[PDB]
Symmetry: C6
Subunit: 220 residues, 6 copies
């Protein structure tokens, strides 16, 4: 990673054995449950492209997913190249060549170049750009290994309303839509997929009941 030391300077540090192991274990234990994304995001804080590639290369199995991720990266890289074309010419002392997409993904760039960009004044944050690409791919994978649509989450006749709501929002976490789309669909669908006794009570509350009010109302 690139971190600040105790004396106020951005420096390169080795990825730690703890970080590496934390990520490997997360994938082993949880596969591509939604929570693997914020865990990846937090474990990769400060990462260079080389560090990100290391993390992705240590994933055991799941190589269909990992290839889909490479394809997502390649599409983002091609968009970057269209938007930020490289001008040819000798690079001046006191300057860094402009990165292409393949450089941000660490494929055609050296570690020294990556540090150069990430610590330039002003910085070209190739780590952060690459990470955003990876997260877009990881979201696709989460959605793909999600077994269930929110349309199929229905409260059972004897199912406590809290357990139903737990299942509903856990399923929703795996959907790949904006938060606004998720929320408004949810309002109405949560009621619609409730069991007849709860649905009755929930209709009675009227629009604009908070979840807390809903869960109190259907406690038994």
């Amino acid at each position: 990673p690139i971190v600040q030391n105790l004396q106020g300077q951005m420096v390169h540090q080795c990825i730690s054995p703890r970080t590496l192991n934390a990520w490997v274990k997360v994938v082993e234990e949880k596969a591509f449950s939604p929570e693997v994304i914020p865990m990846f995001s937090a474990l990769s804080c400060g990462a260079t492209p080389q560090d990100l590639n290391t993390m992705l290369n240590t994933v055991g199995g799941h190589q269909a997913a990992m290839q889909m991720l490479k394809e997502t990266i390649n599409e983002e890289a091609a968009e970057w190249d269209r938007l930020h074309p490289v001008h040819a010419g000798p690079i001046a002392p006191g300057q860094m060549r402009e990165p292409r997409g393949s450089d941000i993904a660490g494929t055609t760039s050296t570690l020294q170049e990556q540090i150069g960009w990430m610590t330039h004044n002003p910085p070209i944050p190739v780590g952060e750009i690459y990470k955003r690409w990876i997260i877009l791919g990881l979201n696709k994978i989460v959605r793909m290994y999600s077994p269930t649509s929110i349309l199929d989450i229905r409260q059972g006749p004897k199912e406590p309303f809290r357990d139903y709501v737990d299942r509903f929002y856990k399923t929703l976490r795996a959907e790949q839509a904006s938060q606004e789309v998720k929320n408004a669909a949810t309002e109405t669908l949560l009621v619609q997929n409730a069991n007849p006794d709860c649905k009755t009570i929930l209709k009675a509350l009227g629009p604009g009941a908070t979840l807390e009010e809903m869960m109190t109302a259907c406690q038994g």
Copy 2:
């Protein structure tokens, strides 16, 4: 988190794997037992909004609780906005735009903005403000998911007084109320709901007895 270096400046440090894992495991092991709240507060010391979002996003399951938490945050954010409305205009050099509620929650703010607020002179402690909102939400969840009401804690005929007291205060810990209200509940119910023999002993020691005295007086009864 934001921590101080040797130069005496506040700077950003990455959240540690140890922290992340400690939080994940505490939720796994304890759910929304009252002690999850101080563990959250301790593990999130110095946290940015981004860090707090990370910690909440890694909670496995309990999504009904997490959704109720978001709703609490949205309520606290609307109030923030009502009390502290943003004034339009360009931001001066070395200065920071005023945060809206959604900026404090990390939704409409970048990491670099959060660092800027938390390290400005004087600080706008958006991490601390957000943590307060989160803790309020967690207190609701703890209460919400408490199985027992304090009114139903009654000493059994053969139950040692110490075990009853343990159960009474464990229940009271999950209530969402000020300390002064919880002290009123104790004064109303603890002696009253003791069993007949202990109750007789306790009524005799009177209102002013310490818990240690009460527990000594009922050691056999």
Copy 3:
């Protein structure tokens, strides 16, 4: 905690996940065995009142004990208030308001105030004062969850003298008396509660035998 950094200045640091976990595990594993006190004392090295409250708030169960602790704190705080009454008036630049008992316990004081006191020149060590109150309460709890009096520790007829002595002093650790009182009672009671064959030998050694001499003498 408040610690010294590498460059010679008292600064606030976050309580570490290790410290938190060590304390939680100690209580889970050992409850209020006497050794929990020096473990609390060592894990709370440098603690602010806020840190101490955190540690106490993480104790799972044992809420009768924890309430007795709060009552002990309140009594110590009232004594502090009697001994160190607060004078009213505006606080000068370059000064800290005088702490009341409720401030030392962290109830009516902010973290910023606690750091202010603990790093003033000269320091008001509100962490150390509060800790002393907590330890007084913890000692009361140890004594309370001690099942056995030293008067009931008697060497059995076939019990190796070493096992008896182990039981005796382990029980004595849980008693709440001064060390002088513990020692002198012990001299005589250890002999008196020994089994008839050992008691014979121990009488024969005369007064002022060390424990080592006693344990050698009753080895079989």
Copy 4:
């Protein structure tokens, strides 16, 4: 390893017990699965030749592989020597003798010489040069100890396409070849070795379909 201190100088640090143990355990648990290679590369970041030798010397068992690794290193060392022959003469103050192949591998060089190379201005990165040799050797071992050939990965009649793709790329990961060669193997075999129903679907999407599209198109077939 060689790491930077506050003065901005590169200095020597002892290899940590955590690092040592992480490497030992990864070999124990995963043998020469492809993912052992990036784990080695990450755990050996900043390593001196001495450190790399330590890590290789602590591998338990697998001595046939380790001997093949030494042979690869000896081949790379002979080539180094052919490209970069040492010139005789006394070494000037503040300067370092030019390394031979055996110096890079840590066999004929002291720790103090390795530090001198890695911290000189500009660096002679003998740790990085040796790591490259080691990684080449490990890639041979991974391939050598792979059980399956890519030609024998064929989708079963009832095998979900996702499971076949997992197996195909897991096999391809163990091949020792450039990325461009591995991409050629995919273009030759993946659709061709799908089962009859999936293959029909995939041939219709055509050469330009992404894996995500292919996996959507065969979700039931």
Copy 5:
């Protein structure tokens, strides 16, 4: 402990949870096996008296041993007091009162006094002096709780000589005696208490044989 910072000054650091737990677990697992002594000495490196008291206070059980340890300390403290009596009078600025035995053991001294002694120029190393007393006490305990006497270590008829030697030196390790005395015990008993066949072989190699030679000579006998 007292450790050095960057300014090259000795300063106080809190005892770490790792240290505390390592000590607790070593006693739990090994009791008063001889190797507990160097583990104590290593874990208490730089310790103040306060720290040493903490480590001793966390020992679970073994209170007969711990009481014998206190008695040893009291004996060493009385001797200290006899050799180094305190002189009355007010302490000058930047100076420290002379420690009594009970000050070294941490009983009548504050932490701030201990820091003052250990960091004064020149140091009064009250941590090191106390550790010496503690180690003397622990050596007594190890000996006290050793099950076997060296006189009873005898090679069995079918016991490999290496196993006998292991047992002989493991027993000798628990003895409380100088190294020169332990070397005398070896010269008296090791060959003498070997079985008839090994003994014959060993007597022939003679007094000057190394252990490695002795163990080679008896590899089958």
Copy 6:
């Protein structure tokens, strides 16, 4: 150990609980398998003589081996004394007495003297010298607890050639000879001890086949 701090100075640090535990566990788990030597070497990086003695004193059991180690140290120390005799006289301010062998082994030297030597300009690296002595002894012990000669490692009739080669080189790791002696013996002995079907194929390859070529040739 003696390490460099962040501000470029050689200082003494306490041996860490991690280091201590790593070494204890290695011996418990692996005894004196060859890999215990590079593990000792790496865990003792920067060690003083006192640290090395600590590490050796924590070894549980294996006291025959440990005594053989002391004997090896004593022989190396006597050689050092013959080669570097100590001249008598008062030691000047700005100087360190010359170390004898017993000083390098930490037996007659204080920690303060060891730090003095290791941080003198120019350094007398008593830690590194002692470690070399210990490693010579440890190699003797490895060879001694090795159950098997390389002459007895023979490929079985149905044994995969890779498993045979694994056994052969694992056995060779425990032999105490130079690397040149190990290699040249190995070339020929590996073929000679192969089973008849492999030996046939290996003869056919001719001299100077690499191991990789040999293992490919006998894959079935």
